[PDB]
Amino acid sequence: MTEAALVEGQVKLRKWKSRWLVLRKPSPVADCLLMLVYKDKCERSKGLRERSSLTLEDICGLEPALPYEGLAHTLAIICLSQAVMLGFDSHEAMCAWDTRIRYALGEVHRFHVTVAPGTKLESGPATLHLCNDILVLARDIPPTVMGQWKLSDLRRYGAVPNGFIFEGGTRCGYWAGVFFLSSAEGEQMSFLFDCIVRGISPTKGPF
Amino acid sequence: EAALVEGQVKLRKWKSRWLVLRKPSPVADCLLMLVYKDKCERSKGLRERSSLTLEDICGLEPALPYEGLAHTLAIICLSQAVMLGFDSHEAMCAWDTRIRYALGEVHRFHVTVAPGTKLESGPATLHLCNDILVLARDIPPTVMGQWKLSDLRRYGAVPNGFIFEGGTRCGYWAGVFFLSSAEGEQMSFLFDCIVRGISPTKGPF
């Protein structure tokens, strides 16, 4: 019997090195991803023990098509600690990986936003990530986490004209307070928020 | 505000209260208990009387006689066991069926533990709960041994039983353990699937 994968294929990793990559959830209810790296597809076909393994246990979000180290079809697995950059040839393979990994991890969504000046947060373009029970803001390539909240620690939030406002409570020490984002998807963000905090997946219904 | 299950349930004297059960996270091993006064104070929209979350769930045990009630379900955690009282065997089965599926891969096997190890001999129940494996006893159930599945070296079905060896990582629970059962081959297949990322029912995770 062979070890299953949510996705597998030829991918570049970090210079760049090409290797056959296997991604799978370590457990049926995992926020984590197990990375299984083989030299080639044959080593995997012949079901030999992988060259290297790694478990990403602090994933904050996914973000495809960021330019990085000479490549354009890259995927970022954003983590509290580090970002893991995946290298693909084709655009559609990258999207396939992004779409498959997203669904598998539960509720993982991203919105391109502009962070308003005035708060502890750095202003300018950024991407807001909802990863199940956690909210994250991410910037730059490779993406780094600049703000993090448990959704359960937010007092208030809501859509506004050309934006979205959320407030972190006492629970989130120095991340407490009111924060302002510009985007055309505030209604989508607020509805996503409304659903999750009540245990509904917008797509799957109740968890 | 959604529920994986709700209905009239007795909880601990027995207090019959409209119970709402749901996951707090779409992919996490937790149950949020929402205790409402009745179906009215819930179907209306009022805030619950009390709430509790259980974040170390390691199994489910239905059909237990407990404090006067024939049909009680135990939600077993590493820390404690939560007892739920029902009226009919069916209503409780419904709750067992619905919770097991919702929490991912949670399985129970009524076994006989053989003497010779740090475990206590006699009838018990092995519980597999996604990442973890557990042996539970009595009413209310208590955990009498625990392992991460990743920390197991070997396992297998044997004529009329099951065996699994724990790695050094396990500490006090390292070593080979023996279980008597008619569901050994079924047990081996489940372990085979899980350690390889396969749900026997749902396929790949």
Binding site: S152, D153, R156, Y157, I165, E167, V197 | P24, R47
Partner: peptide, 9 residues
């Protein structure tokens, strides 16, 4: 702005 049902607990 919406209050959060999770927060009251």
């Amino acid at each position: 702005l919406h209050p959060n049902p999770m927060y009251q607990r």
